Design an enzyme around this catalytic site. Sequence first.
Site, short mmCIF file in Angstrom:
data_model
loop_
_atom_site.label_atom_id
_atom_site.label_comp_id
_atom_site.label_asym_id
_atom_site.label_seq_id
_atom_site.Cartn_x
_atom_site.Cartn_y
_atom_site.Cartn_z
N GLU A 27 0.81 -1.20 0.00
CA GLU A 27 0.00 0.00 0.00
C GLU A 27 0.85 1.27 0.00
O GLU A 27 1.91 1.31 0.64
CB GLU A 27 -0.92 -0.03 1.27
CG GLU A 27 -1.74 1.23 1.46
CD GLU A 27 -2.82 1.10 2.53
OE1 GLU A 27 -3.20 -0.04 2.88
OE2 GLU A 27 -3.30 2.15 3.01
N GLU A 55 -5.88 -15.83 8.47
CA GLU A 55 -5.65 -14.65 7.64
C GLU A 55 -4.20 -14.15 7.77
O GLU A 55 -3.57 -13.85 6.75
CB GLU A 55 -6.65 -13.55 8.02
CG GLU A 55 -6.36 -12.19 7.42
CD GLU A 55 -7.56 -11.48 6.84
OE1 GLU A 55 -8.68 -12.04 6.89
OE2 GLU A 55 -7.38 -10.35 6.34
#
Length: 438
Positions: A240, A422
């Site tokens: 990101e 996750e």
Amino acid sequence: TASSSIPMPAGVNPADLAAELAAVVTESVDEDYLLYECDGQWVLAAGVQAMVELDSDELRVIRDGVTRRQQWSGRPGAALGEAVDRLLLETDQAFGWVAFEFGVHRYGLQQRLAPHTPLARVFSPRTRIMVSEKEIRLFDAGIRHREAIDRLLATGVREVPQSRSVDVSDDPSGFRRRVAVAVDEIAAGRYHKVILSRCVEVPFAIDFPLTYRLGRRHNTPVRSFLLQLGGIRALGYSPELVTAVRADGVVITEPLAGTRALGRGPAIDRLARDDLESNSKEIVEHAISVRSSLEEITDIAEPGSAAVIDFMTVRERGSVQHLGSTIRARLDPSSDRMAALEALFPAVTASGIPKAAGVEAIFRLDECPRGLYSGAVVMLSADGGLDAALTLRAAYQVGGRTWLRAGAGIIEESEPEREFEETCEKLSTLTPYLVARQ
Ligand SMILES: O=C(O)c1cccc(-c2ccc(C(=O)O)o2)c1
């Protein structure tokens, strides 16, 4: 402006040549460095001409064994900015990292930091080697750096050895328990979302440049880095972009939200992509995050300049895929590049919602200080440029300990077992690609 420009040899990818050059230069010169990939250019910032060290209680500028040591107050971005602007009066670019802890001052939480907590480390390099698909450009390279590039071009890049596996299934820090606590705090209305994380030990020493090459050819990050600086070795495939400020005043931020697995073959990946694009839970989190970025960016932008130029599209990141949006604004004349970074840092995927409450919860429910993890690796230019990539999907070596670190966004409906799985998916960006040190 470059004193040498060498055509890139046929069949060689820039990430491979740049990381090999970092290894060759390490062997011959034994200096600190930072390799930063930004829009098709791999910039190797080699050697430290001057270093800015911003800590919670002090700022130090070190050049040739001489230290300027100053107390600072107010915003950490103004203290860092003034010292870095000074480095850039005599050099074109500066590089380094900003810790997660740099972002706590905006929420009034800096008194929670321990004394001497690192906030940033930014240096001006002695030499820069820029590697692109087209050429190798040398800036201020002395005879050892020039001969290292010549030797590498003569031998070619090394074949990457086979990788060595690591077990990520253990939970010594009680991540599952910490997620259950955050879920209860969220249910009590303390906040909406918090990002918690866990470390995974790598019980063997890794070769950082070879691991960098192997992971890079299986990942598509927005930026990437490889560094050896002041006793820290690190590499990452930054997913990101926290902030990019251009010389012309355009500011960009690219928030991500939601995660599904990627790399499981076309059919399974397509089902995951369609689920991600249509799932109410991911859409709501992405919309809330875009609204948060727009609120933040308006504080530093020319009125009416903020815009979402790409909204809620899937961004592929190797072992995972996320929803992303690209937000653009024009930097107001009353603002500056550090105030833009301060307005956008920490990212929501490093903190939570509301961001102030997420940062407060991390002090209690995560291992602190985080340091490089969930902070940024940065590149600053004399013309006003700033590029700041979020440090997730990274590996670290400090004092003989090698580790990985991954987390997850916890909301009211989160389940500890699923959130642990996750973190395993995010660790998979690096775990199949660890090359042991030979
Ligand atoms: O909260 C979300 O939607 C979201 C989306 C994408 C990434 C993350 C996240 C948090 C920590 C890490 C990591 O350690 O990689 O990644 C969170």
